Amino acid sequence: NAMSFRIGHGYDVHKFTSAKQNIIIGGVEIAYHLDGDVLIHALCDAILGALGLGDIGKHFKNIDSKFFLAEIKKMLDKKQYSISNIDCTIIAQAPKMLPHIEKMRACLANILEIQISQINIKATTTERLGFIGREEGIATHVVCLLYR
């Protein structure tokens, strides 16, 4: 017989939220900001993308994003596709990703039950240009290849 391959692509952006002092109003103290895991998000998007399932939005807060990834792993099995490989590009002026990347790979390879060598995570910069260069936020691109 023959086999089937499918590509997904996720893209996500996270805006940094500056922490600023809590304020009192009408005598009550309100902590504020002025959550989302950008990579796992783009990754879920890529996988549902490859499957013609739309995005994470079609299927669904403060729960560890790892959970969602685990639900996507199940949806993946029900559709009877496997991961061939995953490639990730984190785009950030900062923080510095390099120290944490292998941890990310092990973490996700585990949840997804593939080999570390089947999921690549690299980080680049915009060279201080655009909203990412000004450190207003970060983005990630994910591509996945699925097989049956």
Annotated binding site for a divalent metal cation: 12, 14, 41
Q: Tokens standing for 35?
A: 């959550």
Nearer Cβ to a copy of itself (4/21)? 4
Are 101 and 123 within 8 A, CB to CB? yes
Binder among 120, 126, 131, 145 for Na ion (CB under 5 A): 120
Residue owning tokens 């639900």? 71
Q: What contacts 6, CB < 8 A, 6 or more positions away?
A: 50, 51, 81, 145, 146, 147
User: Which residues would be at the binding site for a copy of itself (CB under 8 A)?
Assistant: 2-15, 45-46, 48-55, 57, 84-85, 87, 89, 91, 98, 101, 115-131, 133, 136-137, 141, 143-145, 147
Q: Under rule CB under 5 A, which residues in 25-84 are in contact with Na ion? A: 52
User: What one-character DSSP code corresponds to residue 116?
Assistant: G
Looking at beta carbons only, is 10 or 72 nearer to a copy of itself? 10
CB 2 within 8 A of CB 131: no
Residue with Cβ nearer Cl ion (134 or 148): 134
Residues near Cl ion (CB under 5 A) are 130
Question: Residue 34: how many CA atoms within 13 Å on its side-chain side?
Answer: 7
Decide: is 85 part of the binding site for Na ion (CB under 5 A): yes
